[PDB]
Ligand binder design. Structure first.
Ligand SMILES: CCCn1c(NC(=O)CC)nc2ccccc21
Length: 185
């Protein structure tokens, strides 16, 4: 792809994080701790899942960033509306304000409703995410496989400001402790 010149510097918003997440000093990495991280509760925190938002809000333009997913077994990545539900159970879908892909149980899927099987020959270690606000597009790229396309959401109805979205996944297996990391420009 040729989206690299739209690169934006994303940082994580501590205030939105589930209470078990640990965000690095530079706000560029996040991992799920094995206990509550001793923060107060607030209406912004995702309560039921190990999720966090980027601090940046996008309402126009073209934006690109990259995320390192090395040695993880489960994660979700993409964008979401600023006003998505934080508390209780919900599905990741465009109806609920999410444009995401995931890894789960050795398969990759897009967060449509119902979910869509992805076709990935080279398991990615870094994911590129491109948003074209005006066009209504969210695309995902396999940086490990020379930038090959993973998935495009088109005809998106964002209906609000967008925020970068992350889920580090649970670590029931003991094989999913590694962080998500925002890769340097
Ligand atoms: C993994 C054990 C701790 N735990 C549970 N346990 C439950 O399943 C209670 C409904 N939910 C969490 C949601 C976010 C972070 C930690 C959570």
């Amino acid at each position: 792809h040729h989206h690299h010149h739209h690169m934006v510097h994303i940082t994580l918003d501590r205030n939105t994080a589930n209470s078990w997440l640990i965000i690095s000093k530079d706000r560029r990495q996040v991992r799920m701790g094995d206990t509550h991280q001793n923060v107060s509760d607030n209406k912004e925190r995702f309560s039921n899942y190990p999720m966090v938002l980027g601090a940046q809000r996008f309402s126009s333009g073209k934006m690109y960033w990259e995320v390192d997913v090395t040695q993880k077994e489960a994660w979700d990545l993409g964008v979401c509306r600023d006003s998505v539900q934080r508390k209780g159970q919900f599905s990741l879908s465009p109806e609920n304000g999410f444009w995401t892909i995931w890894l789960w149980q050795d398969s990759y899927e897009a967060g449509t409703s119902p979910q869509t099987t992805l076709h990935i020959q080279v398991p990615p270690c870094q994911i590129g995410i491109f948003v074209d606000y005006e066009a209504g597009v969210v695309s995902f790229y396999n940086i490990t496989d020379h930038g090959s396309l993973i998935y495009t959401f088109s005809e998106c109805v964002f209906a609000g400001p967008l925020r970068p979205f992350f889920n580090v996944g649970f670590n029931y297996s003991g094989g999913n402790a590694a962080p998500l990391k925002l890769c340097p420009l």
